[PDB]
Amino acid sequence: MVRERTFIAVKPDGVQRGLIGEIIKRFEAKGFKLAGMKYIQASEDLLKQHYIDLADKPFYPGLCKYMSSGPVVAMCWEGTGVVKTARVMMGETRPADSKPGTIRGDFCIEVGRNIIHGSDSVESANKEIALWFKPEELVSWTQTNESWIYE
Amino acid sequence: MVRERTFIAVKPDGVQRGLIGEIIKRFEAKGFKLAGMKYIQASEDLLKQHYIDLADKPFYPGLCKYMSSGPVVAMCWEGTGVVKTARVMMGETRPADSKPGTIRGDFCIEVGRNIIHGSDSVESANKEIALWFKPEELVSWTQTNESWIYE
Amino acid sequence: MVRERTFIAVKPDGVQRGLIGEIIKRFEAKGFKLAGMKYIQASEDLLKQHYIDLADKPFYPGLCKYMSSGPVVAMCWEGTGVVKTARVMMGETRPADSKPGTIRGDFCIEVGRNIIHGSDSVESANKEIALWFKPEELVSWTQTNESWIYE
Amino acid sequence: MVRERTFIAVKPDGVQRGLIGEIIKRFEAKGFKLAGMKYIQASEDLLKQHYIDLADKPFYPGLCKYMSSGPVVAMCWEGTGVVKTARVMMGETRPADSKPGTIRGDFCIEVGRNIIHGSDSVESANKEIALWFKPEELVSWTQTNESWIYE
Amino acid sequence: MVRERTFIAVKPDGVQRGLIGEIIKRFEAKGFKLAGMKYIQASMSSGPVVAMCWEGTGVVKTARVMMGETRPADSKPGTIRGDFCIEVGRNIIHGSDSVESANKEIALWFKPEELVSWTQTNESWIYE
Amino acid sequence: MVRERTFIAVKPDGVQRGLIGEIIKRFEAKGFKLAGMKYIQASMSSGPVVAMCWEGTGVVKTARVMMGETRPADSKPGTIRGDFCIEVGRNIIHGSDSVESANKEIALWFKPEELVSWTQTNESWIYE
Numbered sequence: 001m002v003r004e005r006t007f008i009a010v011k012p013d014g015v016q017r018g019l020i021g022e023i024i025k026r027f028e029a030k031g032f033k034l035a036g037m038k039y040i041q042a043s044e045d046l047l048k049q050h051y052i053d054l055a056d057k058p059f060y061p062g063l064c065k066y067m068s069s070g071p072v073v074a075m076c077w078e079g080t081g082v083v084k085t086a087r088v089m090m091g092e093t094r095p096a097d098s099k100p101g102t103i104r105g106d107f108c109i110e111v112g113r114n115i116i117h118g119s120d121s122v123e124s125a126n127k128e129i130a131l132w133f134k135p136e137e138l139v140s141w142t143q144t145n146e147s148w149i150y151e
Numbered sequence: 152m153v154r155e156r157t158f159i160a161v162k163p164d165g166v167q168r169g170l171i172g173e174i175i176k177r178f179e180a181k182g183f184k185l186a187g188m189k190y191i192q193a194s195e196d197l198l199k200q201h202y203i204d205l206a207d208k209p210f211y212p213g214l215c216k217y218m219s220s221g222p223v224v225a226m227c228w229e230g231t232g233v234v235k236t237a238r239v240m241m242g243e244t245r246p247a248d249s250k251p252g253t254i255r256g257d258f259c260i261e262v263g264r265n266i267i268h269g270s271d272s273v274e275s276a277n278k279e280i281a282l283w284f285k286p287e288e289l290v291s292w293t294q295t296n297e298s299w300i301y302e
Numbered sequence: 303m304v305r306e307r308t309f310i311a312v313k314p315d316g317v318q319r320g321l322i323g324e325i326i327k328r329f330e331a332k333g334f335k336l337a338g339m340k341y342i343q344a345s346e347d348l349l350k351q352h353y354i355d356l357a358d359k360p361f362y363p364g365l366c367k368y369m370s371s372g373p374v375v376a377m378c379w380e381g382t383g384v385v386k387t388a389r390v391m392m393g394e395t396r397p398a399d400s401k402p403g404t405i406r407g408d409f410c411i412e413v414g415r416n417i418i419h420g421s422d423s424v425e426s427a428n429k430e431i432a433l434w435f436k437p438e439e440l441v442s443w444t445q446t447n448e449s450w451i452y453e
Numbered sequence: 454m455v456r457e458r459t460f461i462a463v464k465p466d467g468v469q470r471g472l473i474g475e476i477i478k479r480f481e482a483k484g485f486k487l488a489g490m491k492y493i494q495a496s497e498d499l500l501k502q503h504y505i506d507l508a509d510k511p512f513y514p515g516l517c518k519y520m521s522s523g524p525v526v527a528m529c530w531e532g533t534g535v536v537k538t539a540r541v542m543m544g545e546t547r548p549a550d551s552k553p554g555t556i557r558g559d560f561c562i563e564v565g566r567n568i569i570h571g572s573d574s575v576e577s578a579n580k581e582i583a584l585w586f587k588p589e590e591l592v593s594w595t596q597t598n599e600s601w602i603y604e
Numbered sequence: 605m606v607r608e609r610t611f612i613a614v615k616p617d618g619v620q621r622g623l624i625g626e627i628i629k630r631f632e633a634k635g636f637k638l639a640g641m642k643y644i645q646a647s648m649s650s651g652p653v654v655a656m657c658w659e660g661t662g663v664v665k666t667a668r669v670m671m672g673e674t675r676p677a678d679s680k681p682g683t684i685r686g687d688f689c690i691e692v693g694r695n696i697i698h699g700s701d702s703v704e705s706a707n708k709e710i711a712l713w714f715k716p717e718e719l720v721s722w723t724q725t726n727e728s729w730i731y732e
Numbered sequence: 733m734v735r736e737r738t739f740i741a742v743k744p745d746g747v748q749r750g751l752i753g754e755i756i757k758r759f760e761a762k763g764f765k766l767a768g769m770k771y772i773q774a775s776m777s778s779g780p781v782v783a784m785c786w787e788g789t790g791v792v793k794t795a796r797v798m799m800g801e802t803r804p805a806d807s808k809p810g811t812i813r814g815d816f817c818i819e820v821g822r823n824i825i826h827g828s829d830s831v832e833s834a835n836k837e838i839a840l841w842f843k844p845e846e847l848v849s850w851t852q853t854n855e856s857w858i859y860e
């Protein structure tokens with residue numbers, strides 16, 4: 001019964017500013033299915049791998065330390081088109097360019113404090129999910145209202 | 152003053168997923184006036200006429216079938232530019248193309264389970280409202296703060 | 303498959319103050335099932351019958367005229383214990399004695415403007431539902447998530 | 454400073470009815486600190502131990518069976534008086550006796566589908582937290598505005 | 605008609621934790637009328653407070669009910685202190701405990717210029 | 733650090749329709765800092781307005797985005813005008829259109845005493 005998945009994380013600013021439930025609420029209200037979830041303080045080296053494609057960018061060392069500075073909520077969300085749709089729901093990388101109604105549009109201001117992460121593509125999602133989740137931490141179950149979300 | 156009216160329906164998935172109140176609340180908040188409301192399981196005959204323009208589309212027979220599967224909330228809403236504005240508030244026909252902040256943007260995933268209907272034009276609204284409501288079932292009244300909504 | 307029902311109405315102040323959706327939202331969120339709904343401007347004589355047991359009270363003539371002064375949303379809600387549970391959700395007859403968290407506790411101030419009505423007992427509900435609803439206006443359907451509300 | 458901790462679980466009906474975010478959001482809003490969170494379909498063995506005190510109750514075997522039917526959200530929350538206060542926020546064991554404003558008061562109907570669990574005491578919390586979480590899975594951190602929550 | 609009035613303040617912890625709008629929304633939703641509002645660091649004085657005067661039938665006692673008990677521990681869910689805080693020294697909001705207190709507190713915090721006379725157009729749907 | 737500041741007013745239709753708290757909650761949620769607040773009938777003057785000064789990086793243009801277009805008809809859902817109103821003459825809120833406008837509007841509506849200097853303790857989670 002399996003459907004596309006993506007990796008979503010509430011960043012340390014999201015946790016510190018009390019937005020975990022508000023963020024999850026939006027993904028539930030959309031009809032997406034929660035397949036995995038954990039709360040951790042990730043190591044700086046874990047984040048260096050998560051953001052490996054950015055290793056040469058000037059903000060990278062500070063981004064990885066920052067993302068390891070507090071707990072994060074790591075999540076796997078599942079549904080048709082969830083990878084691209086979640087990005088839409090978050091807004092742009094820069095909150096300044098994110099529209100009201102989006103998570104970043106509604107809740108934050110700066111690119112370095114943009115509360116949330118979502119995979120940018122299916123292949124990125126597959127890598128990120130495997131990096132953060134062990135296979136047994138991914139739950140298979142079926143939403144009773146699946147009939148009303150998918151024909 | 153009598154203003155423009157549109158026909159809005161909460162589809163069976165919208166009723167089943169408990170979004171009636173949320174949808175009505177968005178229209179009240181916007182400033183529009185409720186002019187008619189009933190709750191029915193519509194006949195397939197009625198829906199075939201409702202969607203008569205799409206009678207040759209592949210999805211037509213399934214659409215009408217599905218829209219008559221359960222109760223819907225049928226509404227008439229009144230206010231300046233309410234036809235085009237209600238459509239903006241719902242989003243695009245496909246939720247995948249709808250923006251966060253809109254009803255479909257926030258709440259659903261698939262074009263076949265897109266929780267709500269709105270007339271696409273004034274002429275469409277005139278036909279639909281007459282199809283769903285008897286004249287005696289429409290309510291004319293004046294919002295006390297209508298002067299804070301309209302100059 | 304039938305379960306207890308009650309009659310709930312959004313009074314004219316509830317409609318005028320934009321609380322229809324907020325009220326319905328609360329009954330949906332609770333797990334109750336919407337069985338019937340209509341929007342009407344009820345006659346003063348209909349209300350005189352609705353409130354017949356109060357015919358000798360000083361506020362009665364003014365209460366019946368008032369309740370016929372604007373549109374009301376008439377509803378039948380269904381579920382285990384719904385009659386008594388809905389009253390709890392509304393608060394006391396007097397908003398002054400209704401606790402925050404209740405509909406009257408949150409949204410109004412005076413006994414004569416207390417936004418909502420609910421049947422006080424099963425026998426009252428049976429009478430009120432029959433007075434306001436024709437039998438065909440009552441919808442039989444089954445909430446897909448009934449399994450998660452009732453064991 | 455290390456403060457009191459409690460074990461809180463979103464039950465399978467709570468997950469299925471899309472109330473994860475809403476529940477977490479209430480605990481964040483109150484000022485409590487998230488100290489642990491995982492998402493699992495628990496073994497029936499684990500639940501039999503979780504509820505071991507109720508092993509002779511008629512509802513016990515069905516309870517454990519049901520709690521292992523789907524994924525639950527397992528949580529550790531931290532703060533002054535969090536054990537007794539979390540229980541207040543959920544309501545009474547039976548939703549019928551729970552007040553509007555509480556989680557069960559707002560969201561459910563039956564004692565067997567009462568969406569959430571909280572430890573009934575500190576000693577119960579110590580056992581439950583150890584049963585559901587390995588030491589390495591609990592997160593110690595400091596809320597930046599903790600000084601606006603505690604003097 | 606000028607109705608009963610009470611003093612309500614969002615305390616510095618209320619301002620710091622971003623609860624100003626949430627508190628105001630509750631009093632507006634209830635049907636009470638905002639009569640006065642300012643934002644000041646008074647000369648507790650650990651930061652800005654929102655000082656307010658709300659007006660309506662029985663607003664003094666009702667606003668206290670809406671806040672919850674003095675201690676959040678004794679405050680019920682649905683109330684402001686019940687939903688949003690934990691400790692007695694960090695209980696986010698203040699409300700006058702009587703008409704006399706209210707009258708004194710209003711006079712202390714507000715100049716008469718700062719109490720605005722107006723009528724909610726929906727007043728006839730709130731007050732008989 | 734003193735950051736950029738803009739003038740925002742809840743218009744009389746905004747006050748009359750009970751949207752003050754809702755508007756404030758949006759600016760608090762976004763992470764902007766309330767710098768000044770009053771409530772007055774200015775000498776449009778058809779009733780009370782809530783006058784505010786909000787502070788943060790890019791607050792002038794961002795607050796305009798949060799409001800939506802000048803006309804609610806062109807305002808998108810999610811925005812204040814998009815969610816809550818219909819006509820251009822009843823568009824509930826005002827925001828300065830530039831830093832220069834903001835500076836002038838703030839000076840016009842607020843005395844320097846009424847701009848409170850403070851720091852959100854969560855500032856380090858909003859600003860790098």
Ligand SMILES: Nc1ncnc2c1ncn2[C@@H]1O[C@H](COP(=O)(O)OP(=O)(O)O)[C@@H](O)[C@H]1O
Nearest residue numbers: 054059063092093111112113114116117118120
């Ligand atoms: N110019 C920048 N300055 C500081 N931080 C940045 C910048 N660009 C990106 N970041 C941070 O790095 C994270 C990952 O970057 P990237 O993968 O490019 O964006 P996204 O999160 O949209 O996929 C961003 O979410 C943001 O927190």
Ligand SMILES: Nc1ncnc2c1ncn2[C@@H]1O[C@H](COP(=O)(O)OP(=O)(O)O)[C@@H](O)[C@H]1O
Nearest residue numbers: 205210214243244262263264265267268269271
């Ligand atoms: N390609 C499609 N496949 C399935 N159902 C569709 C498709 N396109 C439209 N529908 C359904 O038919 C309904 C009516 O179509 P249409 O009138 O074109 O759109 P709208 O609802 O936006 O007015 C849509 O709301 C949608 O639920």
Ligand SMILES: Nc1ncnc2c1ncn2[C@@H]1O[C@H](COP(=O)(O)OP(=O)(O)O)[C@@H](O)[C@H]1O
Nearest residue numbers: 356361365394395413414415416418419420422
């Ligand atoms: N003392 C009173 N003064 C004015 N109106 C009243 C009074 N008591 C009751 N009412 C109005 O009459 C309605 C019906 O009264 P009743 O059936 O006694 O209360 P309830 O609505 O709780 O069943 C109330 O909801 C209220 O609007």
Ligand SMILES: Nc1ncnc2c1ncn2[C@@H]1O[C@H](COP(=O)(O)OP(=O)(O)O)[C@@H](O)[C@H]1O
Nearest residue numbers: 507512516545546564565566567569570571573
């Ligand atoms: N009489 C009952 N019938 C069915 N299930 C029950 C009954 N009483 C309790 N339960 C279930 O067992 C759970 C555990 O019981 P208990 O520990 O007594 O209550 P609480 O959950 O409030 O701590 C309850 O939350 C409820 O879901």
Ligand SMILES: [Mg+2]
Nearest residue numbers: 051053054120
């Ligand atoms: Mg990237």
Ligand SMILES: [Mg+2]
Nearest residue numbers: 268269270271
């Ligand atoms: Mg169409």
Ligand SMILES: [Mg+2]
Nearest residue numbers: 353355356422
């Ligand atoms: Mg009665």
Ligand SMILES: [Mg+2]
Nearest residue numbers: 570571572573
């Ligand atoms: Mg127990």
